[PDB]
Amino acid sequence: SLKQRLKGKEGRVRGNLMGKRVDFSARTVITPDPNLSIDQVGVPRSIAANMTFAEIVTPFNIDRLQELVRRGNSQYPGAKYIIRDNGDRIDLRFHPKPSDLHLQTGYKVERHMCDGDIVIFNRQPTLHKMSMMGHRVRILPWSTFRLNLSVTTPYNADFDGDEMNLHLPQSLETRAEIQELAMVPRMIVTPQSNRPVMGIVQDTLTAVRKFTKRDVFLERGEVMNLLMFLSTWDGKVPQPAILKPRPLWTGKQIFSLIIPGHINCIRTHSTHPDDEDSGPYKHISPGDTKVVVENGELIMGILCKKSLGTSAGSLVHISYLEMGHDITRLFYSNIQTVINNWLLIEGHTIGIGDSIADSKTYQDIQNTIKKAKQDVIEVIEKAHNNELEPTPGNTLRQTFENQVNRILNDARDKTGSSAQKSLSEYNNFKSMVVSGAKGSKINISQVIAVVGQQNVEGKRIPFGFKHRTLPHFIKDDYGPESRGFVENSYLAGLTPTEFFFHAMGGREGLIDTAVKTAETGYIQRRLIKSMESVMVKYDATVRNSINQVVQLRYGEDGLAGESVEFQNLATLKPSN
């Protein structure tokens, strides 16, 4: 009927007006390219040779456009249409058309997209304004899109069959709008949390952790190779931190060149012991923590997520605030290029050797698990003889479940601590956990020590069968194996009951992921549609569509959230 056409999604108002299908847009699978700058998008020659941008044939570029016309549509750096002033369009694809190639001022030539053209790159679950960023086209062979890895985080991307959308602005005005508003370097720091969105992620972060130790000394040739990749290098080779015996540079010394300008920063590495700041060696750091960057030189410290990542006060954040968007873009690209080309020498891996511990630690983990099992058996026996008083606020059964969960979680925590403390300083799992590139302590604990309690609906594996979790158990077996504790670690392999319990836990997670999406998306739409038209007027008062004063000053102070940062009052706390 007439009403069903004008309805919600797939209707008219939302399916054809507030959102509509657009021209000059392409899509293909994205694929990593660490060589491309942060503000570049790798575009195949087919997408470029199809998408066209109209350029007014000014007398400055009548020659270049005439050559593009002469190329035709076959040659890639060519053109498809000539739009003469009266609106008539002459098509270059069909026949050479030798009398229609004439160009004068005021005509338009629909040239194929070339390197440097500003495009808007989109990942369809567009949640924040850092999800549609302006890139610069670079044409690369093969038929995939290619974007830098630090741009993976803002898009929430991952190159596993992922696809992105490439919108090409067509007028000069919209090109300038995207260039001055939504380029990647300008959107390093989001106003959502006054933190950077893009950080050194994945391989380059792990190699930065390995490259910024006191261990790493670089010879002359490796220094030359690394310094070739700095786009911001002034051409001066720094004097090595080690001279006569054999000129050897240091990883931090080369990283000092990457750091833009005169940036000051103080951070703490992940493995920074708590007592160093209070004890001596506060400024000496035996473990080489406490990153201190002074005058743009990395004086000391191991760089990890806590300094080169998307946290407040990170070195990338300080770079954006102090230096600017252009220099910070150069910083990102240089870090990636130089650190990847050093990682070619150093290398990184993961394997079975990193998921196996010493026999002593296996013994300690097994003993802790058995002690926890004996404790839970004792608690079951105590509850069966009615020697357990009901904790205030909980019934007896909930008190027993809390006791069992406490014992098993304490066991998992202690076993994981033992496994973590048993990792070799060369361990790849530990390298990635300390680097923060990909991993967590619980992941090491599960792959080495114990997988842990498996929970469904927040409680232990529920009694699906009649008073028994599986047919293989006796009724009313509340012991750790029966109700969901997976004693075996991932490497040790899980017994069938533990396998089914892990299937139940993982399935719970999957169901949550697949069922929360509708509610979250609907909530986002309601939020946007509630305040879509609310803006800061030129009198610095925040007003809605009916000029109703919402906030007298935006955010009660009148300052945008990209520039603010955390500071300490230094007068609120101290005594009189």
């Binding site: 038929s143 005005e173 050797g353 396998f499």
Partner: protein, 525 residues
């Protein structure tokens, strides 16, 4: 023991499963009788006397690996993986590529991928013997290196050896079938398979018709490119209107088999199969048997690939960062078992709950062959020649190619077709359609404060339109532009008319409202 003895002689003894069941040995238990059944997972550990847990077992399980279904039994060492990775593999195995049926030559089916050189896994599960996975493999064993070589494998991507793909690695054929049916619909309206001449059919397309034979069908072997005509066909209009079948855009295949028959109604019926050899490029998708999925980031040549002291350059390099968070360990143990099996010469066992295949046992067996017990190998950089200071974990892992190829996903749009109703770009890649600028995109752009780009996307890029609106009443006015006689019936106005540029979608919205008696007046004063 007698039952197993007669089953080992299953041939020439006429002892089957039904004899085993009829002898009172095995019993079917349904779900609600399983409640009143106490089950022993394995005999050798539960029946025997120990510190007793249950002394009243009523049934025992044949092997606990039968809980897993058909697609999840191909997972090697699935008990070591995180369960969501097993689910991802279960989904991915159906999308793997291989010989789907041994008589694909006769069946003319749409979207038929046939892999070139399938290999049966070197780390196999016993269940795979009954799924016939050995007889129709979907995948191939690749010398997988877990290394971070040049950053083109970061996130989930992989680095595929160009030389391997050069020698036939993962190469596949994509058979696509096109079906056309002659029919008699009207009295004088007749469809017929015949080659259209240049001037006999009123409807024509810029395609090339020279490949069609006298019958209107291309003979096999003809190298048909995109837009080329496959089955010549035209309808006698009440002189003729062509209705021949073109190819999909950017295919560039070769005809395999062209078939003529009669359909149910007795008309002439044609089915044409075109094969396109799809060499693995750097947009294609590859997945392990453990949920480790990724696009081929880049295709380095053999010299560029790192090499062992022996000369084994990895065919696929996967990211070390993929593993630790998702805790896929069947991949690592499967690489170890693949190395030990390829060296030893047998096909290793990856049955889930075996308790006689430990990591340490595989490691010792690997150390017995001159390799590192953990599977590591000292690797040399192919560019500079230097040893890589960190030893790379190299092992033969079963990787399977997926149906998701980039040449079946890449689309570009620049002023193509429009829908009949909305006058906006069509929906889809096949209809030369355009990407959608949904509501979330416009919310993002508003957040940017980008009014002009938003207007271009939602006005100029899509349907642009011009209407004439009366000034006295906002109802659109009759506008004869060539005669320049702009008249608004309803107030007899002929002079006070203004031109409004609005999207055609908004014009349709206003007219649809007018057909519901609502008058959306567009007043410009």
């Amino acid at each position: 023991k007698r039952h197993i003895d007669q089953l080992k002689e299953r041939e020439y003894n006429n002892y089957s499963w039904q004899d085993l069941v009829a002898s009172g040995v095995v019993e079917y238990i349904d779900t609600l009788e399983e409640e009143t059944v106490m089950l022993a997972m394995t005999p050798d550990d539960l029946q025997e006397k120990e510190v007793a847990y249950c002394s009243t077992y009523t049934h025992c399980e044949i092997h606990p690996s039968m809980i897993l279904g058909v697609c999840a039994s191909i997972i090697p060492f699935p008990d070591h993986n995180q369960s969501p990775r097993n689910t991802y593999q279960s989904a991915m195995g159906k999308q793997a590529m291989g010989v789907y049926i041994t008589n694909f030559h006769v069946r003319m089916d749409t979207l038929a991928h046939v892999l070139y050189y399938p290999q049966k896994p070197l780390v196999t599960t016993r269940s795979m013997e009954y799924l016939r996975f050995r007889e129709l493999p979907a995948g191939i064993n690749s010398i997988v290196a877990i290394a971070s070589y040049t950053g083109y494998n970061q996130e989930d991507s992989v680095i595929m050896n160009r030389s391997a793909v050069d020698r036939g690695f993962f190469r596949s054929v994509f058979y696509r079938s096109y079906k056309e049916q002659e029919s008699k619909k009207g009295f004088d309206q007749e469809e017929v398979f015949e080659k259209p001449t240049r001037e006999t059919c009123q409807g024509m397309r810029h395609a090339i018709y020279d490949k069609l034979d006298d019958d209107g069908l291309i003979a096999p072997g003809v190298r048909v490119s995109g837009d080329d005509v496959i089955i010549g066909k035209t309808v006698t209009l009440p002189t003729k209107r062509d209705c021949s079948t073109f190819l999909r855009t950017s295919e560039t295949g070769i005809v395999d088999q062209v078939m003529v028959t009669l359909n149910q109604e007795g008309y002439k019926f044609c089915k044409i199969r075109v094969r396109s050899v799809r060499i693995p490029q750097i947009g294609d998708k590859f997945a392990s048997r453990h949920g480790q999925k990724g696009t081929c980031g880049i295709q380095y040549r053999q010299e560029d690939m790192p090499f062992t002291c022996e000369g084994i350059t990895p065919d696929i390099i996967i990211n070390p960062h993929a593993i630790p968070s998702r805790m896929t360990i069947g991949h690592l143990i499967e690489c170890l078992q693949g190395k030990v099996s390829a060296n030893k010469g047998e096909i290793g066992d990856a049955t889930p709950f075996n308790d006689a295949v430990n990591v340490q046992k595989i490691s010792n067996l690997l150390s017995d062959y001159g390799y590192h017990l953990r599977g590591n190998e000292v690797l040399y950089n192919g560019f500079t020649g230097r040893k890589i200071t960190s030893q790379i974990f190299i092992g033969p892992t079963y990787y399977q190619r997926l149906k998701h190829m980039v040449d079946d996903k890449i689309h570009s749009r620049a002023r193509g077709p429009i829908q009949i109703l909305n006058r906006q770009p069509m929906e889809g890649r096949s209809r030369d359609g355009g990407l959608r600028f949904g509501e979330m995109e416009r919310d993002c752009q508003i957040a940017h404060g980008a009014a002009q780009f938003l207007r271009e996307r939602l006005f100029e890029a899509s349907d642009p339109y011009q209407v004439h609106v009366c000034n006295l009443c906002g109802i659109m006015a009759i506008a004869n532009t060539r005669t320049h006689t702009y008249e608004c019936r309803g107030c007899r106005n002929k002079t006070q008319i203004s031109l409004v540029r609005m999207p055609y979608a908004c014009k349709l919205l206003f007219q649809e409202l007018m057909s519901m008696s609502i008058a959306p007046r567009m007043m410009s004063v």
